[PDB]
């Protein structure tokens, strides 16, 4: 099917009509998304099939056709952009200064933006357009607002 680099919606026809369950990134011939979007199932791209190649439930990430290719990291100082792809709506860029998730294993950038569940896997970018992680795995804080980690994988 289509192998051009860019952002893609992940759809299913299992439910009513065609439903957007998430989003992902095609880069260097590999499709990258969050594990909770596909649960590691195979995907279709036109008449072609994309098979899982690497996945990890704890990281909440999965790659198809080859190993995880995204390795840029948030600089810890600058604003980034969420390239949100909401269900039934055009791709839109939202600029924000990340906050931080402090964990026992180190600090991770986090974005305080709330989009529909089907926006999970949308990329977060730096000023050079590099993908520094995927949006959609996070927490709900006291105010009731959603805060997503900037989740990034390891390039072997």
């Amino acid at each position: 099917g289509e192998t051009t680099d860019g952002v893609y919606r992940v759809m299913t026809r299992r439910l009513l009509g065609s439903t957007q369950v998430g989003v992902g990134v095609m880069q260097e011939g590999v499709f990258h998304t969050m594990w909770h979007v596909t649960k590691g199932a195979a995907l279709r791209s036109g008449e072609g099939r994309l098979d899982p190649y690497w996945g990890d439930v704890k990281q909440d990430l999965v790659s198809y056709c080859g190993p995880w290719k995204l390795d840029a990291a948030w600089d810890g100082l600058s604003e980034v952009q969420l390239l949100a792809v909401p269900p039934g709506e055009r791709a839109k860029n939202i600029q924000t200064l990340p906050g931080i998730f402090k964990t026992k294993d180190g600090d991770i950038g986090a974005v305080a933006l709330d989009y529909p569940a089907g926006t999970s896997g949308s990329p977060i970018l730096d000023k050079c357009g590099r993908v520094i992680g995927l949006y959609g795995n996070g927490v709900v804080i006291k105010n009731g607002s959603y805060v997503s980690a900037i989740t990034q994988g390891k390039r072997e």
Binding site: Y8, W35, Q95, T96, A112, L125, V131, V139, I141
Partner: protein, 39 residues
């Protein structure tokens, strides 16, 4: 049966809409990939 459909190029947009705060939170990550708040 899941399928993918292209939605756009990955680029930074000059003068994009700017919003969101920057919370500093103590969090925990469990074996199932769920984040939770540590209080």
């Amino acid at each position: 049966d899941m399928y993918i459909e292209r939605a756009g190029d990955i680029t930074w947009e000059k003068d994009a809409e700017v919003t969101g705060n920057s919370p500093r939170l103590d969090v925990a990550l469990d074996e199932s990939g769920d984040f939770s708040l540590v209080e």
